[PDB]
Design a protein around this ligand. Structure first.
Ligand SMILES: NC(=O)c1ccc(-c2ccc(-c3cc(NCc4cccnc4)n4ncc(Br)c4n3)cc2)cc1
Ligand SMILES: [Mg+2]
Lengths: 297, 258
């Protein structure tokens, strides 16, 4: 079953298991193999969620699950291979920067993949540069659905831990009973800013540090800007009250349309925060193309 | 999430056809019956109550069982093993804190080993080809609840109670899609409590009328009336609790007037 695949090298470790670059001996196709060892507690819930959800989600901006190989001892997921992840690409682009048409294209594609996820009742809940994969042809794709979940309408209370700290939405930090599609938008907004500046927008090292960093950039939220905020479980009346800074200073290279879109993605109130679907029609994308990455990957 | 409520509804309507079990599978099972299935599902209601599991988890597990038994012949002594692995898989899919494998072994009353439950889990996955994100009666109901003017907790809990009862009896509920049963259950709950009917806005949303819901609604009315006499009693006991507003203690109407 694994006989036709030839491993090349280890790519890395995500939510569960280990990812290897491999080559299909018969077709020539280069793939990524996600190996899970069942040496316990059965098949992990993370693998169960990723497989079932990805078999439903066929989209050009979602990493494609090609096959599932299910031995007695090991479980292998066969994925399409992409050349680079967004984090490592941003590090290599330190000198030249990332061209604005490429940033615009990447954001447009990411919003497409995200809109598809949300239209199919799926929350990703782990959007970060490491989980965003790029090819030589100019495509960017959502990856690692290990922390993903199928949601209901309206939502119940789901797992609290969710989303890597730097990209975690304020409603999660303040401990709201319910969160939804807006958490994924928040993460993308953070990634948008990070593509322009090439550094993380809110790099906290604890929950309280993360909130205070967000407050110093967007202003401390009140009942006017976000109704119900003061009644949220982890809100404290002792929170310092910082003023909202001029949005042209948060990400200085950004034009009027860019800044407008970013503010709507980083809106405090989850209800007011722009959906992925609605963001596709934003004036920022009027002149969008699909250029190849300016660097060899 | 009002931006996606229509997209999600449309998608769930597509997936429920694809996830539908084979209607007459019990005729093809040599050693098990509808009655034996009814005992298993009722037992799963108790397990759900014992471990404080979501109602969604219970609905998912039953779907996994019915789809499994649509293609796999199972002897009576092994039916509980299928049910246990199904409930374990549903817990892993749906719960924030699923009960551990050892706990699932304990509630089988030591009938099976840890190895057997794990081997069955793996087999159920193979047979279902890891396709576990199935639409349920529950998933449709919560969408339908948003069309209340205004929201009524007795209506909500009674609809959940009635939809849960449909899980017990393969004849006749295997022939109805989750969205239809949810329709029947919502109207029946709304009529029992308030006197109101299946609202105009849900006709627009679902395409279903009282006319199209009538056959399922006719069966569900009969299950409701005959509920205190049914051999299986765990759902009625469950819905006595104040958590579900004691709705099982309400009186079913004598006539629907269709
Ligand atoms: N800090 C973290 O928690 C962390 C670190 C690394 C990773 C990580 C895991 C896997 C991958 C990865 C990377 C690539 N491709 C990039 C690549 C190709 C060749 C060599 N190196 C990277 N692919 N392609 C398909 C798949 Br499925 C895939 N997965 C990237 C980053 C995730 C989280
Ligand atoms: Mg039979």
């Amino acid at each position: 079953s694994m006989e036709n695949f030839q491993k090349v090298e280890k790519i890395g470790e995500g939510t569960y298991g280990v990812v290897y670059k491999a080559r299909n001996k018969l077709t020539g196709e280069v793939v990524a193999l996600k190996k899970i060892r069942l040496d316990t507690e059965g098949v992990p819930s993370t693998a169960i969620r990723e497989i079932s959800l990805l078999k439903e989600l066929n989209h050009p901006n979602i990493v494609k699950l090609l096959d599932v190989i299910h031995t007695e001892n090991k479980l292998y997921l066969v994925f399409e291979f992409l050349h680079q992840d967004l984090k490592k690409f941003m590090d290599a682009s330190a000198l030249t920067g990332i061209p604005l048409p490429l940033i615009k294209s990447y954001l447009f594609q990411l919003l497409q993949g995200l809109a598809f996820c949300h239209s199919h009742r799926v929350l990703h809940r782990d959007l970060k540069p490491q989980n965003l994969l790029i090819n030589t042809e100019g495509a960017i794709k959502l990856a690692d659905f290990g922390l993903a979940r199928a949601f209901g309408v309206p939502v119940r209370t789901y797992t609290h831990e969710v989303v890597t700290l730097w990209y975690r939405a304020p409603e999660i930090l303040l401990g709201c009973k319910y969160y939804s599609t807006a958490v994924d938008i928040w993460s993308l907004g953070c990634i948008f800013a990070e593509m322009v500046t090439r550094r993380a927008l809110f790099p906290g090292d604890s929950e309280i540090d993360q909130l205070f960093r967000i407050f110093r950039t967007l202003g401390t939220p009140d009942e006017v800007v976000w109704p119900g905020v003061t009644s949220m479980p982890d809100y404290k009346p002792s929170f310092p009250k910082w003023a909202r800074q001029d949005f042209s200073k948060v990400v200085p290279p950004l034009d009027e349309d860019g800044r407008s879109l970013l503010s709507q993605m980083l809106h405090y109130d989850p209800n007011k925060r722009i959906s992925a679907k609605a963001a596709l029609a934003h004036p920022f994308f009027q002149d969008v193309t699909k250029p190849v990455p300016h660097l060899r990957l | 999430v009002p931006d996606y409520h229509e997209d999600i509804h449309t998608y769930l309507r597509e997936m429920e056809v694809k996830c539908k079990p084979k209607v007459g599978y019990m005729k093809k099972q040599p050693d098990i019956t509808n009655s034996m299935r009814a005992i298993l599902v009722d037992w799963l209601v108790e397990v759900g109550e014992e471990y404080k599991l979501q109602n969604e988890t219970l609905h998912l597990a039953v779907n996994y069982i019915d789809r499994f038994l649509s293609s796999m012949s199972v002897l009576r002594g092994k039916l509980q093993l299928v049910g246990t692995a199904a409930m374990l898989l549903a817990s892993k899919f749906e719960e924030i804190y699923p009960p551990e494998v050892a706990e699932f072994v304990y509630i089988t009353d030591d009938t099976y080993t840890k190895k057997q439950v794990l081997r069955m889990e793996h087999l159920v996955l193979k047979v279902l080809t890891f396709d576990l994100a199935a639409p349920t009666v529950n998933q449709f109901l919560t969408q339908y609840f948003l069309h209340q003017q205004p929201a009524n907790c007795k209506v909500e809990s009674l609809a959940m109670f009635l939809g849960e009862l449909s899980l017990i009896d393969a004849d006749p509920y295997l022939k109805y899609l989750p969205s239809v049963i949810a329709g029947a259950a919502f109207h029946l709950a709304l009529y029992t409590v308030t006197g109101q009917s299946w609202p105009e806005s849900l006709i627009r949303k679902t395409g279903y009328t009282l006319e199209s819901l009538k056959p399922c609604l006719m069966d569900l009315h009969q299950t409701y009336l005959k509920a205190p006499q049914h051999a299986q009693q765990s759902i009625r006991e469950k819905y006595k609790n104040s958590k579900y507003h004691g709705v099982s203690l309400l009186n079913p109407p004598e006539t629907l007037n269709l």
